[PDB]
Short mmCIF file of N, CA and C in Angstrom, two decimals:
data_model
loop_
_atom_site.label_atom_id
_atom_site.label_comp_id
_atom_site.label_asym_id
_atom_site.label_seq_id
_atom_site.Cartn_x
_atom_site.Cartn_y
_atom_site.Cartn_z
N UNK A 1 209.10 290.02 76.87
CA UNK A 1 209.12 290.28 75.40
C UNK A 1 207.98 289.59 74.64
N UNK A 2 207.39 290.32 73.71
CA UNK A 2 206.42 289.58 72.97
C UNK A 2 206.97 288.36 72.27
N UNK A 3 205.06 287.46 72.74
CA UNK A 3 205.70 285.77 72.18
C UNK A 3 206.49 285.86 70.74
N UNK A 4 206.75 284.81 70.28
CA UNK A 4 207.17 284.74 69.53
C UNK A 4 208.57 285.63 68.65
N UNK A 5 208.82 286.79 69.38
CA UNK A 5 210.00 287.38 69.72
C UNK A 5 211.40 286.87 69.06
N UNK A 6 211.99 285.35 69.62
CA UNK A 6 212.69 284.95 70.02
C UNK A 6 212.96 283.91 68.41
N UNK A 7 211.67 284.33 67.57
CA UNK A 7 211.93 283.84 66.50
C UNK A 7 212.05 284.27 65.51
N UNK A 8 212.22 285.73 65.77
CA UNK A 8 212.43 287.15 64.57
C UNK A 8 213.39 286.49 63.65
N UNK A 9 213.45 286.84 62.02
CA UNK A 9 214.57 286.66 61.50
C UNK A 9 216.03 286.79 61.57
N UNK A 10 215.78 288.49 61.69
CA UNK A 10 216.96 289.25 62.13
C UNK A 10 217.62 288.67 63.49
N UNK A 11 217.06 288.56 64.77
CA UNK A 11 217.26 287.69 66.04
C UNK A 11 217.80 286.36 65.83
N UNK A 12 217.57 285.85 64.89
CA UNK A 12 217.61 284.64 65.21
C UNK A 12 219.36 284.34 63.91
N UNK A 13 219.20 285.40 62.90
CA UNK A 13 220.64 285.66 62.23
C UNK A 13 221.59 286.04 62.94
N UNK A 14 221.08 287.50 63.58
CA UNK A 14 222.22 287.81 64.55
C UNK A 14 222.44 286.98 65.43
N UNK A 15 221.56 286.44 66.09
CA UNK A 15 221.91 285.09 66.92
C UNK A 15 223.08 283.96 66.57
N UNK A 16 222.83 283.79 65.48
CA UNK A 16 224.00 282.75 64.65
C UNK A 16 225.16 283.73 65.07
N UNK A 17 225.17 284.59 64.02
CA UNK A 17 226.35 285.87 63.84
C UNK A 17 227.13 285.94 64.64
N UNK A 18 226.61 286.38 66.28
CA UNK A 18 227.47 286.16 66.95
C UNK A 18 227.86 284.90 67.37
N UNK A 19 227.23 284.03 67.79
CA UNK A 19 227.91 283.16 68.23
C UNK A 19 229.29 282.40 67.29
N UNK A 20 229.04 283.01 66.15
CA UNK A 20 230.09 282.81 64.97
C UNK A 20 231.33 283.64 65.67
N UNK A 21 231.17 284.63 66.01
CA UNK A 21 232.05 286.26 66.67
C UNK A 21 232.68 285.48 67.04
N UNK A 22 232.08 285.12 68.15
CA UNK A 22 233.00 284.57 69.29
C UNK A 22 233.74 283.08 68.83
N UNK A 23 233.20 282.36 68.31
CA UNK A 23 234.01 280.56 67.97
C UNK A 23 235.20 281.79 66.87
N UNK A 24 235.36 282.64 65.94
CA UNK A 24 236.37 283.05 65.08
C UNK A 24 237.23 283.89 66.17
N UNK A 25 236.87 284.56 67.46
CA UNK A 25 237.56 285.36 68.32
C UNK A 25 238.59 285.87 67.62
N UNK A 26 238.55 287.00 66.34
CA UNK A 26 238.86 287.76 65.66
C UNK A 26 240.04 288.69 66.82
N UNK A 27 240.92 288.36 66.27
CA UNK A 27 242.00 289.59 67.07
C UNK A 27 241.86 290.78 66.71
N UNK A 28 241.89 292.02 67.54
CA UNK A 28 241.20 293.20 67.45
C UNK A 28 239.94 293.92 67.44
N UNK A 29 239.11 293.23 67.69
CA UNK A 29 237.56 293.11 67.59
C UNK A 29 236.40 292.50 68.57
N UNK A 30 236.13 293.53 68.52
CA UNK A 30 235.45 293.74 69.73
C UNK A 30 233.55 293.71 69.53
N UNK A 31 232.80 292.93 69.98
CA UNK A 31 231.59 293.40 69.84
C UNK A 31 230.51 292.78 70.78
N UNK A 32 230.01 293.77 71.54
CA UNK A 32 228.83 293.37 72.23
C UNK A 32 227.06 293.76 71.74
N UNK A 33 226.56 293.12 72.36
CA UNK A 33 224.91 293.10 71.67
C UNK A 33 224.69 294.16 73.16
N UNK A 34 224.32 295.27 72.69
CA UNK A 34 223.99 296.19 74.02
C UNK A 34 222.22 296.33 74.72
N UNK A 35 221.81 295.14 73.94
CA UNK A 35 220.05 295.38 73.43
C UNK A 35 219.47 293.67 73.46
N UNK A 36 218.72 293.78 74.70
CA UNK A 36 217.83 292.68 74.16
C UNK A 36 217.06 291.71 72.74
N UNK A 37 217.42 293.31 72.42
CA UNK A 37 216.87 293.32 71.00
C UNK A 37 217.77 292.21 69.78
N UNK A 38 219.01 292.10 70.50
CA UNK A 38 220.47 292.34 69.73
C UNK A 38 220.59 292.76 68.50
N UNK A 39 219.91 294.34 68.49
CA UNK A 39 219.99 294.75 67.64
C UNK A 39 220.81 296.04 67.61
N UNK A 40 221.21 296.21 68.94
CA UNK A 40 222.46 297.48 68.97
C UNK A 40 223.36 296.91 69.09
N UNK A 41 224.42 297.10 69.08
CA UNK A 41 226.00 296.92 69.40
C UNK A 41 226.79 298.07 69.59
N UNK A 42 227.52 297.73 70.09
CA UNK A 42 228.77 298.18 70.99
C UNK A 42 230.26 297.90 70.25
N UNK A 43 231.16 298.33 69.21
CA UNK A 43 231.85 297.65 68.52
C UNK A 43 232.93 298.66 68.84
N UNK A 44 234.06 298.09 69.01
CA UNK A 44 236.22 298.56 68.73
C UNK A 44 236.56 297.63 68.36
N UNK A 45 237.45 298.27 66.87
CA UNK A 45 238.19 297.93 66.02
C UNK A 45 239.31 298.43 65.92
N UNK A 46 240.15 297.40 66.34
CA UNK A 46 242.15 298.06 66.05
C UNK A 46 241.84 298.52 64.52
N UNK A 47 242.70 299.24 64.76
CA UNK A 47 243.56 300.41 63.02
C UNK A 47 243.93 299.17 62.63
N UNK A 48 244.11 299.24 61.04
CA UNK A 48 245.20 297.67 60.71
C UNK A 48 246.16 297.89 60.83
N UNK A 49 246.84 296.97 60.26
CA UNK A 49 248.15 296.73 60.51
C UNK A 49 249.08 297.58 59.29
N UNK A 50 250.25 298.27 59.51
CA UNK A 50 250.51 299.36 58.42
C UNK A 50 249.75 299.85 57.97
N UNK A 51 248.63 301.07 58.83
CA UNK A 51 248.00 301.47 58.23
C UNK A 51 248.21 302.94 59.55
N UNK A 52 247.93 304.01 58.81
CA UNK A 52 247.58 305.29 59.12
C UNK A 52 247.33 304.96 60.47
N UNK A 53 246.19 304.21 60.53
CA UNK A 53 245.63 304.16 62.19
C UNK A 53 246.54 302.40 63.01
N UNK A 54 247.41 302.63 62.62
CA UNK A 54 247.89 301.24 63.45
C UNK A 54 247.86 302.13 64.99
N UNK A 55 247.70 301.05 65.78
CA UNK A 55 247.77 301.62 67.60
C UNK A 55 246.14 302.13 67.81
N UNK A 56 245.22 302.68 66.87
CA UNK A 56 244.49 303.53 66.88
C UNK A 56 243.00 302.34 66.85
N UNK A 57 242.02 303.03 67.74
CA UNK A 57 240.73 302.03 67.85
C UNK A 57 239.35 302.61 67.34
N UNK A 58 239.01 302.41 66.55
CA UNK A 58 237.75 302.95 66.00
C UNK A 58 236.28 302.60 66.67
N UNK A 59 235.88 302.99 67.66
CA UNK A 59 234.60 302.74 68.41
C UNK A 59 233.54 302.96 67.81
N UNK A 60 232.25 302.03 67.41
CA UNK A 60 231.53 302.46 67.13
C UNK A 60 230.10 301.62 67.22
N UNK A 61 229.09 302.33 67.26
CA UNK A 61 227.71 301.72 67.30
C UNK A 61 227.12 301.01 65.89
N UNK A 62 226.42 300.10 66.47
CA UNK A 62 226.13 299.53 64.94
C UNK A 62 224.32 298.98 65.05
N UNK A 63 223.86 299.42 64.51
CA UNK A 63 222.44 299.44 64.21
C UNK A 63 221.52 298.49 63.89
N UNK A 64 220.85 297.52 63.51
CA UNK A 64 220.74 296.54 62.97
C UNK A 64 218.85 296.66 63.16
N UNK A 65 218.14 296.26 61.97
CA UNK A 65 216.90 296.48 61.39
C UNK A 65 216.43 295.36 61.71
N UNK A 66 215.28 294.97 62.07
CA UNK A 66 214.08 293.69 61.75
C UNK A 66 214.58 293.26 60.20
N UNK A 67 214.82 293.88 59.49
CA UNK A 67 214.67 293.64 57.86
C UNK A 67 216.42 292.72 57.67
N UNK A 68 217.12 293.06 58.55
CA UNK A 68 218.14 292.49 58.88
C UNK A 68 218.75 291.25 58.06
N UNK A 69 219.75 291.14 56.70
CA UNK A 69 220.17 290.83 55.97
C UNK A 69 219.75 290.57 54.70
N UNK A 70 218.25 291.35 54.65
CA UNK A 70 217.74 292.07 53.67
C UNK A 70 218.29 293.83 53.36
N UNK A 71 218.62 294.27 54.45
CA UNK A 71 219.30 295.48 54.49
C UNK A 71 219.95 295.13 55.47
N UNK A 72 221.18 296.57 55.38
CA UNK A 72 222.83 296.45 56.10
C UNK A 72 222.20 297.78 57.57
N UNK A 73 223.25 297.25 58.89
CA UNK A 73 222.75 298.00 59.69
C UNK A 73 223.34 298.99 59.59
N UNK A 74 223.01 299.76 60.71
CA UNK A 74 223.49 301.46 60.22
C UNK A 74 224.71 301.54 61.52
N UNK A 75 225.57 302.08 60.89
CA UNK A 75 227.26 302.16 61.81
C UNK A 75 227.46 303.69 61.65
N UNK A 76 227.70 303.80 63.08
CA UNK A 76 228.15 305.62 63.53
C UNK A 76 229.31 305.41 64.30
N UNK A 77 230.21 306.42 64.29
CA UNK A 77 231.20 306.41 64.92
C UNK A 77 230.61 307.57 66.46
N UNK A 78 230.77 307.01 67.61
CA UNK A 78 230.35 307.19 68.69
C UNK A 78 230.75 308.86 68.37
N UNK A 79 232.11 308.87 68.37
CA UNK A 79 232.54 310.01 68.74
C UNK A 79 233.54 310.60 67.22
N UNK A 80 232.36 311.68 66.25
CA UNK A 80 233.09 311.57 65.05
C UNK A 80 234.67 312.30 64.89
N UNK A 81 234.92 311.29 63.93
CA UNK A 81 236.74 310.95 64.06
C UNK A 81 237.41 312.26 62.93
N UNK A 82 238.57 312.72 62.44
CA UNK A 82 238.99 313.46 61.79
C UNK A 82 239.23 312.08 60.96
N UNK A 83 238.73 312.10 59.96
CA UNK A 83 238.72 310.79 58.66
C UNK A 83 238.40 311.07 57.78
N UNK A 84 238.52 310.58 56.23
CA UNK A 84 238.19 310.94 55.07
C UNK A 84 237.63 311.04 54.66
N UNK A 85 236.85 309.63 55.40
CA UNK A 85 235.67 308.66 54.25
C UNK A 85 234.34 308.84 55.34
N UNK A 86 234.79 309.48 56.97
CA UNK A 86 233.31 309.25 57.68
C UNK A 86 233.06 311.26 57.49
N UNK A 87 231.37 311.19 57.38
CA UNK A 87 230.71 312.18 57.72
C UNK A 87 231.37 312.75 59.29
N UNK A 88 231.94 314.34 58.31
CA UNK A 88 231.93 315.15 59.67
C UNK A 88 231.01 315.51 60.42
N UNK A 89 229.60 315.82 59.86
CA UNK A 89 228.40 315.96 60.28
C UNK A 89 227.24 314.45 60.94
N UNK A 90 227.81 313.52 60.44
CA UNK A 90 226.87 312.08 60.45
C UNK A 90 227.56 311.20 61.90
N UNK A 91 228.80 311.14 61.55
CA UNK A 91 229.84 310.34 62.57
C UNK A 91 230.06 309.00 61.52
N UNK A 92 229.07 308.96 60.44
CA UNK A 92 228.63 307.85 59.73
C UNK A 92 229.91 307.35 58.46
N UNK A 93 230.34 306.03 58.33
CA UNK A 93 231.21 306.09 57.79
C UNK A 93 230.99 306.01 56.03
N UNK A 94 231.22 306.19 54.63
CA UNK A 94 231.14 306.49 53.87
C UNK A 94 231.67 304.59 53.29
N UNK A 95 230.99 303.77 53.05
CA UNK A 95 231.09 302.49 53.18
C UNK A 95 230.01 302.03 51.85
N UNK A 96 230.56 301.80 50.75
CA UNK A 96 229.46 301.08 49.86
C UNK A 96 228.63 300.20 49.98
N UNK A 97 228.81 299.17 50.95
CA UNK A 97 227.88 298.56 50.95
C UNK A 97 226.95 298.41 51.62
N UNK A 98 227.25 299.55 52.51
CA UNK A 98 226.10 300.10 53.61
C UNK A 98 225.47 300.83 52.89
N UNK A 99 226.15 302.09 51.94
CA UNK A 99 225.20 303.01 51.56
C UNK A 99 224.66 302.63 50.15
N UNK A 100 225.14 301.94 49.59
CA UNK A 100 224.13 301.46 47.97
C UNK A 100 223.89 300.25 48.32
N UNK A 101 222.32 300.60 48.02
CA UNK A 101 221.66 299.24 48.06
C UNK A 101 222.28 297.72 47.10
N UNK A 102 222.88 298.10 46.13
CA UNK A 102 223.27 297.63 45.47
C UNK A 102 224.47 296.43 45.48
N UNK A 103 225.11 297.53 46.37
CA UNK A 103 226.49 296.90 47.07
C UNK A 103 225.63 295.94 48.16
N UNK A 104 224.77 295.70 48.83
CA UNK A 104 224.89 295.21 49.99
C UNK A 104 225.07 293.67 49.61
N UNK A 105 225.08 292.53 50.29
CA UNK A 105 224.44 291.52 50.01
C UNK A 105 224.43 290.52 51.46
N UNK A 106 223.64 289.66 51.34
CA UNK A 106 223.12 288.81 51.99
C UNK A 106 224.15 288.50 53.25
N UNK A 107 224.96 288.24 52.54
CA UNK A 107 226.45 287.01 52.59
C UNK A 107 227.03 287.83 53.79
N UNK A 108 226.88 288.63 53.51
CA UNK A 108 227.81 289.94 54.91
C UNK A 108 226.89 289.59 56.42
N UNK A 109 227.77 288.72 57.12
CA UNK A 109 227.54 288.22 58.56
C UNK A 109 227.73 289.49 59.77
N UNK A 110 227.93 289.81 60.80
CA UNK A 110 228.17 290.34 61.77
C UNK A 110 229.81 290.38 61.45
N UNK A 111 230.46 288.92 61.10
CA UNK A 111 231.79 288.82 61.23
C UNK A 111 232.31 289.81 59.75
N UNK A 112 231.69 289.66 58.73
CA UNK A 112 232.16 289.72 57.95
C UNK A 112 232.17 291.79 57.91
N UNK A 113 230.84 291.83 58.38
CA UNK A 113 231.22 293.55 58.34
C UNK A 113 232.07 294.61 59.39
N UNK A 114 232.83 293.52 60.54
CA UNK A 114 233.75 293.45 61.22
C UNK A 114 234.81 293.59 60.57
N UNK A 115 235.27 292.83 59.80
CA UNK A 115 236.34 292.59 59.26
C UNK A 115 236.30 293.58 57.62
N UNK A 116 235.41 293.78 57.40
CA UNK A 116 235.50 294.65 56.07
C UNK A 116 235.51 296.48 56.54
N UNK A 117 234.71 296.34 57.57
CA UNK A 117 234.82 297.96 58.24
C UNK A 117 236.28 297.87 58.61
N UNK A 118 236.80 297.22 59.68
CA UNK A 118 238.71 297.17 59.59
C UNK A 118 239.29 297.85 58.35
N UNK A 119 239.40 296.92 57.71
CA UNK A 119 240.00 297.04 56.74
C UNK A 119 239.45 298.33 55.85
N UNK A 120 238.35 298.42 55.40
CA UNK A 120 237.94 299.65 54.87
C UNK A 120 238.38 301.23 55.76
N UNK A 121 238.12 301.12 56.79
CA UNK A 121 238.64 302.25 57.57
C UNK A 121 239.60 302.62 57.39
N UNK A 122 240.65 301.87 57.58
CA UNK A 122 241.89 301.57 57.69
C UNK A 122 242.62 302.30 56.75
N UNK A 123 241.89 302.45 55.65
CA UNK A 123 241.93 302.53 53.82
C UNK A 123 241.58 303.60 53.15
N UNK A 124 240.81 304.71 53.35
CA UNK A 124 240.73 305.94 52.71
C UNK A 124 240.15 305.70 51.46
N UNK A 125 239.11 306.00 50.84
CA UNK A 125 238.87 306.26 49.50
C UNK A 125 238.91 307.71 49.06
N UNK A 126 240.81 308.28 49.03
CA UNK A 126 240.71 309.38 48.78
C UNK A 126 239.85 310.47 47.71
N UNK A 127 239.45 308.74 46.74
CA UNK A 127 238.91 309.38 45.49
C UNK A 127 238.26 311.13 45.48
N UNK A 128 236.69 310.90 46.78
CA UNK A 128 236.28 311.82 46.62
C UNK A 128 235.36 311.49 47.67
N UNK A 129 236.50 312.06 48.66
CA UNK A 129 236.05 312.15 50.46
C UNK A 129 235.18 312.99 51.15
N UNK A 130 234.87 312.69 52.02
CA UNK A 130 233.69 313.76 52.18
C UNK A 130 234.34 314.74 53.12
N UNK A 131 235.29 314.52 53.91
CA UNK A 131 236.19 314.84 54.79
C UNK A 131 237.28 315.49 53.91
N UNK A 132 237.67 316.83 53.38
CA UNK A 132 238.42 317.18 52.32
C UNK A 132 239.49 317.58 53.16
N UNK A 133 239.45 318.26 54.46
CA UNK A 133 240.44 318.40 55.19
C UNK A 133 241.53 317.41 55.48
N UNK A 134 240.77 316.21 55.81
CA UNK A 134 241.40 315.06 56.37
C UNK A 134 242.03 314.36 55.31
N UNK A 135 241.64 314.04 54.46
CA UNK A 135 241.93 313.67 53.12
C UNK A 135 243.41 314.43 52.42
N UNK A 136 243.02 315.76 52.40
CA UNK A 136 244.07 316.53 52.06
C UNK A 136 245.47 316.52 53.00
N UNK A 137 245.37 316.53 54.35
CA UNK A 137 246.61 316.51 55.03
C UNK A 137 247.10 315.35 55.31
N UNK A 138 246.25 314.15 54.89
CA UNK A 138 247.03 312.61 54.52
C UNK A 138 247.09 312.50 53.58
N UNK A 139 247.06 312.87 52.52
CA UNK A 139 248.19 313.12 51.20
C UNK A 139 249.44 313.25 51.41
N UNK A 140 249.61 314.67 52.19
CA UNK A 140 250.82 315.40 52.05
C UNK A 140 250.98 315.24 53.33
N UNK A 141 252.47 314.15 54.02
CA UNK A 141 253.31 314.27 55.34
C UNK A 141 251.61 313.16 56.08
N UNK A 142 251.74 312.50 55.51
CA UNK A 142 250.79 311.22 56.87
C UNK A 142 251.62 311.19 58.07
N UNK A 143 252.14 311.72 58.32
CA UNK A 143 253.16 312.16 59.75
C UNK A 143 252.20 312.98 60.67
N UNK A 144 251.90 314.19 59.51
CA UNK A 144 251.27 315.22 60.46
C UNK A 144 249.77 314.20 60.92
N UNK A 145 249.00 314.02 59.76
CA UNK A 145 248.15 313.18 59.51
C UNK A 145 247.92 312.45 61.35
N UNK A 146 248.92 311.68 61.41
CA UNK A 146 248.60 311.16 62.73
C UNK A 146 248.55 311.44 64.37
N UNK A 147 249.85 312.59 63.98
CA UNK A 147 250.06 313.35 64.97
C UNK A 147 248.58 313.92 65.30
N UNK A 148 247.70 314.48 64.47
CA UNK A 148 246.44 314.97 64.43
C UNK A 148 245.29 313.88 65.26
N UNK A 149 245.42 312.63 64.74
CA UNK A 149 244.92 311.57 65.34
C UNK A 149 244.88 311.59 66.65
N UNK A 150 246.30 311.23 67.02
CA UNK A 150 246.54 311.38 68.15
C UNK A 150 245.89 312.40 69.42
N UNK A 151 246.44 313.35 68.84
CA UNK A 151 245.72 314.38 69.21
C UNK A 151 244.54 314.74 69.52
N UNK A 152 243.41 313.69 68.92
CA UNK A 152 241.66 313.71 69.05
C UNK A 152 241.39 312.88 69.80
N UNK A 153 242.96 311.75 70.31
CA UNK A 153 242.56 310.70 70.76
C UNK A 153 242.82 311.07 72.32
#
């Protein structure tokens, strides 16, 4: 690897980051650095708890820039999910503070966008989903809603 490499910003944050991962060993959460780079990852996330997706694991890749806590990395769902809030077309999840610059900030660790993707997933912003199908039949009978889940799973 080129010298000096090993002293990238981003490298040397994510470097912290995880080793943070692991000393918090977050129940349900899963994440490996798939990249020398450690700038890919490898991430599963349990459904929360009383939530639509309890039992249910959200797999997904997570992206991460040189520019790296100057900007948020980019998260795809490996294999796109029947969901509200992720692009049927992208796999990509519909997440403010990934997608407005505005929303992002500094402060958001490896751990912390672990734990806010959970929970955000978990959560639906039925407001005005991009997923209208999915959205619409977890309104009405979240029964069927999961059965459907299931079903993809």
């Amino acid at each position: 690897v080129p010298r000096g490499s090993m002293h990238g910003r981003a490298y040397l944050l994510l470097h912290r980051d995880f080793c943070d991962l692991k000393e918090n060993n977050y129940k349900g959460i899963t994440a490996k650095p798939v990249s020398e780079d450690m700038m890919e990852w490898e991430v599963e996330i349990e459904g929360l708890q009383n939530s639509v997706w309890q039992g249910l694991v959200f797999q997904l890749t997570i992206h991460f820039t040189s520019e790296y806590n100057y900007a948020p990395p980019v998260v795809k769902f490996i294999t796109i999910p029947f969901h509200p809030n992720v692009d049927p077309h992208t796999g990509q999840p519909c997440i403010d503070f990934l997608d407005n610059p505005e929303k992002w900030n500094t402060n958001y660790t490896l751990s912390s966008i672990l734990l806010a993707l959970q929970v955000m997933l978990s959560n639906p912003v039925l407001e005005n989903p991009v997923n209208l199908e999915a959205a619409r039949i977890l309104v009405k009978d979240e029964s069927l809603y999961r059965t459907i889940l299931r079903l993809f799973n």
